Each structure stands twice: as structure tokens, then as C-alpha cells.
From a paper:
The N6-threonylcarbamoyladenosine (t6A) modification at position 37 of ANN-decoding tRNAs is one of the few modifications that are found in the three domains of life. In the first half of the reaction, YrdC utilizes ATP, L-threonine and bicarbonate to synthesize an unstable intermediate TCA, whose threonylcarbamoyl-moiety is subsequently transferred onto the adenosine at position 37 of the substrate tRNAs by the cooperative action of three proteins YeaZ, YgjD and YjeE. It is now well established that YgjD and its orthologs Kae1 and Qri7 are responsible for the catalysis of the transfer reaction.
We report here the crystal structure of the heterodimer YgjD–YeaZ from E. coli in complex with ADP that is bound at the interfacial region of YeaZ. We cocrystallized the YgjD–YeaZ heterodimer with ATP and MgCl2 and determined the structure at a resolution of 2.3 Å. As expected we observed clear electron density for a nucleotide bound to two metal ions in the active site of YgjD, which we interpreted as Mg2+ and Fe2+/3+ based on electron density levels and X-ray fluorescence scanning at the Fe-edge (data not shown). The Mg2+ ion is located 6.2 Å away from the Fe2+/3+ ion and is liganded by the carboxylate side chains of Asp11 and Glu12, and close (3.7 Å) to the β-phosphate oxygen of the nucleotide. We did not observe electron density for the γ-phosphate group of ATP, which probably has been converted into ADP during the crystallization process.
Residue numbers in the entry:
A (entry chain C): 1 to 230
B (entry chain A): 1 to 336
Amino acid sequence: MRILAIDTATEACSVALWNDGTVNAHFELCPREHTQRILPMVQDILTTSGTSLTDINALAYGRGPGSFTGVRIGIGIAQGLALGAELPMIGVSTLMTMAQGAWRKNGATRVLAAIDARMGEVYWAEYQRDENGIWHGEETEAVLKPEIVHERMQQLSGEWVTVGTGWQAWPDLGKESGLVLRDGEVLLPAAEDMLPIACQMFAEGKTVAVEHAEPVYLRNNVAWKKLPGK
Amino acid sequence: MRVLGIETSCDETGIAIYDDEKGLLANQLYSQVKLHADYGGVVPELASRDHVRKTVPLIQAALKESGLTAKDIDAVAYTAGPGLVGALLVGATVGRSLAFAWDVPAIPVHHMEGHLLAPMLEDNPPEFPFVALLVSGGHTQLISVTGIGQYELLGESIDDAAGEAFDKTAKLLGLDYPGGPLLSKMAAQGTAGRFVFPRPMTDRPGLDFSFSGLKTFAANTIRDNGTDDQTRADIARAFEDAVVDTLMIKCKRALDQTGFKRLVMAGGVSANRTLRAKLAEMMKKRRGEVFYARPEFCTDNGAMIAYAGMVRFKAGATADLGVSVRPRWPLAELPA
Ligand SMILES: Nc1ncnc2c1ncn2[C@@H]1O[C@H](COP(=O)(O)OP(=O)(O)O)[C@@H](O)[C@H]1O
Ligand SMILES: Nc1ncnc2c1ncn2[C@@H]1O[C@H](COP(=O)(O)OP(=O)(O)O)[C@@H](O)[C@H]1O
Ligand SMILES: [Mg+2]
């Protein structure tokens, strides 16, 4: 199969192509530049791998959580691409992608992902990889205050690694948890790490048509106050 | 030739297809007004989220409506500004990336040039030169238009735009946001002349506008008078007549100054029925012509974007692979 992945949910922009047994990937920090870099990266990957958009079997996109604007950039681009080339789409959690990154970098199999969500919160997940390489823990995804994370960590056990910008903003996040924590060495998701997840999803038929691709924001209380009485 | 047009500048998602032989082949529009009404203003985060929900589906509906397929589209145009960054980004990312996948040119469009050119979508369109009165939610400008992208600013608002003025006064009359259209309907119920509002900046020569003082006058009038339905109709009428006289007086002066015989009106306020009637009456006495779009193309829509897209494509305004938006983008800065 051939799978194209795109991500812009955080400070990083990345594109990566699973091309029948090899990976061709780009990754950089693009603060302020995501929309200037993302299509040129896609173009470059397709050209250097000698594939065209209509040879692709699915388009994997970073679904969120993360920067609201970023997440929308990602799914915007991914949607026009998928609409344009009639590609099925595969939404991948930015939290799960960082877990996979940790597995890639250092063999980690139990990951505490925390993204700095601002407003003194983090986007949180507990991911654990089984013997078949499947990541369990998607039901744990949430936007949480640090003191609630702390409570949650006291209900966990064993050894975990930490990933994501949540841990930099709040390095004492696991204080008095009772867990052995090590640095997972991943701050940001990479499209390259969406690929193994998406390939698996494709093989199992977990794709959606472009009109059903949705972002996962996790924080949905985002309005100011309603007028008196509604 | 056919152009797909995409409009997501504020709180309307609009998609249209414009064919230069056969005309408008599709026009899809979703308005978010119910989402924002609860808040008394457009909430950017929510506007942005709802553009995502709507853009792709309304594109699919547009193609189905027109009975066309990808290969029948020659270019994809999208509103790049001015407007809300968050909203603009949704339509620009989808559009630019769609253009990339279809391997067709992508045409970024200036939202107010869309408004300006909407009258070109009707029969008997205006020939150059003309004075343009752009009168929208956040814009109120008099422009001398000598050709595509030759826009000389002649007058503009120094405070509130005419649309804001309508909405702000409507809110004082207890109407839901945006209340301009409803204010206009209430006004049809009013006794002409029972109240009399100033025509600001009509006592000295010049072409700029101000409308803020008009809200003040409305609010004081709503205070010193009864809160029955009629009295509110009468205030709505006085407010409307004054804005319309002001716009008229100023259009007269710009026609005088330019010597031009053609007056083109555009933006959401150009849907206002009193305004349309008064400018038409004026252009008849002057022995010139007035032009405007159908009421549904005065307010934000995709048709104007597909049309202006076609014009800009033919003028060579194609984008590279980057996507950019310009939330503030003066019309005078567009090239010819
Ligand atoms: N007006 C814009 N035009 C193009 N890209 C933008 C714009 N605003 C934001 N972005 C992209 O989205 C990213 C996330 O924006 P934001 O969440 O506001 O975080 P920050 O501004 O702190 O980078 C930006 O880094 C930028 O690359
Ligand atoms: N019949 C009308 N009379 C007066 N104002 C109107 C009427 N119809 C729409 N409007 C006003 O036009 C504005 C919307 O203008 P439009 O060009 O659609 O949006 P934008 O300002 O977002 O480009 C609002 O201020 C709205 O209240
Ligand atoms: Mg609007």
C-alpha cells in the first residue's frame, strides 16, 4: 500500500509517505509557516518518491488535539487533497503519534502523553502498546487541569515514559504519583509516526470518506458568555 | 471556462460555480447566523469550526447541483481576505489544496472585489468607469473605478460602517443579531418624518462618512419616547431614511466630482430596499444608471467569488503552493 500522512497540529509541520516498504518523510518546526511549507513538502515527497496523489491508498491526517488553528490547517489541506484525488481518510491522534514516536526512538511501550493546551491545561492520554503493536488507551484522551492529572496518575501503576509539551510546561506533573517516569524524548508528533498506525487502520478498513473527516479538539468550551436569557 | 468559488470570510460558507459561456451553474450557501445570534456577535472560534463542517459538503453539493465532475473545473478561487483569519484559513486551505490535487490554478480573491463585481452577474452589467459605493458590515467606501484593479479611494467611514450602524441600532430596538434586515422591515411600518436624524458630514463638502453619532441619536430617541411597537417602527424608519439620504448625498458628490454617469452599489447594505429605490430615482434624474446585484448576492455569497476568481484568473492572478490570508487587505492596494 501507499499512505500519505500530514500533520500541523503543533509547532511542527510534517509530511511522510509510506511507499510500499520505505518511508520518505519531512519534519520541521514551522511556527508561523505551516501554510507556507505544507504543500511544498507534499509536492517534494510525491516527486522524490515518484508517486502521484492518485496512486495513494489513503490520506492520514493529524486529527488533534492541539492548536485549534493548526489542527484546522491540517484537516483543511488533507480534505482538499482527499476530495481532489478521491482518497479515503484516516484520522490519527497527535497523542498516539507521540507514543509511537517514543516506541520508535527507544522501545517505549507505555506512554503518558501531555500536550500544553494553554489556559493551564493539558491534553492527556495513557497509551500502551500490545505484542501486536496496537496502541490501547484512546478512551483516556482528555483536556485536564494538572491537579486532575495528578489524581489520575495515582490510579496508575508501573513504569511509563513521558512525551509532549505538557511535561515541559509542567515538569512536576507526576509529583507524588508513585510511578517510575522516564523521558520519552518526544515533544511533538511526526507524520512519520502516523504511518504505522494508519497502515494498520487501512488494512482493517478504518477509513472515512472526506465529508466525515473531523477534528478532535477535546476543548469545546470555547465561546465567550451568551447574552442574558439566550 | 468554469471556476469553482469558495467563500469563508466570516460567518457564511458559500460555494459557487461560474461558467463564462453559460453563467452561474451552482450556488450553495450556509449561514451561521443562528450559531452567533445567541452571542450578539460572531464568535471566531465557532465560525472557524463551522466552516470546517460546511466547506467540503457544500463543494460536493455544488458539483452535484451543476452536474459536473472534477475535470470540468478550470480553476479554484477562494477568499483570501479581508475577514477573520480563522474563517478565511478554512476556505483557503481546502481550496488551495483542492487546486493542487485537481492540478488546476488556484486564484486568491479579495472579498470586497467580490462584492464590487457582483453586479456583473446580472443582465446589463456596468461598463467602466463608475463610482462604487461599497457598503457592508465593516466597510463603507466610495470608490472611483476605471477598470479591474484600478480603484481610487474617494471617501470612507472614519468610525462605523453603514452595516454596523444598522446592526447596532437594531440591537437597541431589541432585534437579534445581525438585525439590519429586520430593522429595515420594521421601518416599512414607520410614520415618515416623526423623527429626524442627522446626516452626518453632509453640511461640509467632502466624501468621507461617519455613522457613530447616529446610534447615539437612536439611543437617546429610544429613551425619551414610548416603547410601543409603532414608536420603534418610527425610529427604525428615521434611522433608515437618514442613512439612505447620507449615502445618496455622498454618492451625488462623488458623481459630481468624477463626472461619471454610472453608480454601482455593493455589500450587504446594498440589499436595502429604500437604498436601492433612492439611488435608482437619483440616477434617473441625473440621466445615468444605477447597478446592483440581486439581494442575495449583496450579502456574502460564493457566486461573487467564483465570478471575481474568473476575472482574476484571466488577469493572471494565480497562487504558488503557499497558502496565505490577509485579514486586513485594503482594496486600493490591489494591482490592475
Ligand atoms: N494568519 C495566519 N496565516 C497563516 N498561518 C497561520 C495564521 N495564524 C496561525 N497560523 C498557523 O497556525 C499556527 C498555530 O497558530 P496559534 O495556535 O495561534 O499558535 P501561535 O500563533 O502561538 O504559533 C501558527 O504557528 C501558524 O503557522
Ligand atoms: N436589507 C438590509 N438593510 C440594511 N442592512 C443590511 C440588509 N441586508 C444585510 N444588511 C447588512 O449587511 C451586513 C452584512 O454585509 P455583508 O457584505 O453580508 O457581510 P460582510 O460585512 O461580512 O462582508 C450586515 O451589517 C447586515 O446587517
Ligand atoms: Mg456575514
